[PDB]
Amino acid sequence: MENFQKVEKIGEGTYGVVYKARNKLTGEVVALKKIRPSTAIREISLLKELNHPNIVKLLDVIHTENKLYLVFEFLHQDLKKFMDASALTGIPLPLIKSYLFQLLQGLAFCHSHRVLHRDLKPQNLLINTEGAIKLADFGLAVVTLWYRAPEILLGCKYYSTAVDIWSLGCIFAEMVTRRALFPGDSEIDQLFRIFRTLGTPDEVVWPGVTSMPDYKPSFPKWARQDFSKVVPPLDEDGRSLLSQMLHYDPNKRISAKAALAHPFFQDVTKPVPHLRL
Ligand SMILES: NC(=O)c1sc(Nc2ccc(S(N)(=O)=O)cc2)nc1N
Structure with missing residues (x-):
């Protein structure tokens, strides 16, 4: 993602690494998860419409070059x-x-x-x-x-x-x-x-x-x-x-x-x- 300027690695789970990042175009600060199937993406695509005040908002799902990135609203x-x-x-x-x-x-x-x-x-x-x-x-x-x-x-x-x-x-x-x-x-x-x-x-x-x-x-x-x-x-x-x-x-x-x-x-x-x- 050349679309982001990773500020720092903030976490790591079994599903990948999450970084605090800034969208160099919009300037918004987000949580970018680098993950690493269709049943997967299709499954994820459901999560995007899973919006609730107590669920971290999944903003964007990007699939590119054998890589899956998830953009989430950034929490403190x-x-x-x-x-x-x-x-x-x-x-x-x-x-x-x-x-x-x-x-x-x-x-x-x-x-x-x-x-x-x-x-x-x-x-x-x-x-x-x-x-x-x-x-x-x-x-x-x-x-x-x-x-x-x-x-x-x-x-x-x-x-x-x-x-x-x-x-x-x-x-x-x-x-x-x-x-x-x-x-x-x-x-x-x-x-x-x-x-x-x-x-x-x-x-x-x-x-x-x-x-x-x-x-x-x-x-x-x-x-x-x-x-x-x-x-x-x-x-x-x-x-x-x-x-x-x-x-x-x-x-x-x-x-x-x-x-x-x-x-x-x-x-x-x-x-x-x-x-x-
Ligand atoms: N994984 C995610 O979706 C995340 S992680 C995140 N921010 C964040 C900020 C600070 C800390 S810490 N360790 O308390 O300084 C931990 C996490 N925001 C989202 N959406």
Whole structure:
């Protein structure tokens, strides 16, 4: 792209590299993703018409010389950087609530249009100075496993919208405690960290779990811990919501739409964050 003057590399995912760039003609600043099929582009072309206030806007899709570039509206900072910047004091609850609420709206929208994110993590949740937060880097049909739903880790071949609720629940907990909920460093360690905290799933809480591709009758049997210890600073409404976002059975896991009606959001507002850019 000679049409842009890459200002700096701002990120890197499994789908490619993203740069902060300036359109040397219009002068606009954007996020340019260099990716590297028709089912792909056709799939992407859907994403362009996927416009919502809590979804990073995909501006242009460019296919040239064996290269695929995606131009996105540029957002100020990602949630991982913001959480780190807020580690000494923690993000204030009203702001945590606002962000969670907006992200659920974004997911509710995606899911109603049959689009799944599949790889939600603090690094692809972007925020601006006006208090908004948006979903970025939608995943298409050293990697972080911390936000991966248990059914994915157990070999499910068909993801459901529930995997996004799980990831968001993990992010919610992390914003509240200032510590990753399940910081695994391998698929099995990830799986076992979830088990040690939520209890090893069985047929009672998760019908069908013992018949999953990577399930092993030999998994250790850990008892479930209390949420009071898992996310202590969270009030009971928040813990109630989190528990529903972290149900083992994808079918019992709360939907984005239902989560939006949870009492936790009765007093939701939209604070502005203190961003250091
Ligand atoms: N991937 C995307 O679509 C992106 S990434 C992005 N900007 C951005 C700005 C600052 C930071 S950081 N690490 O907090 O300084 C991270 C990301 N905007 C879009 N649309």
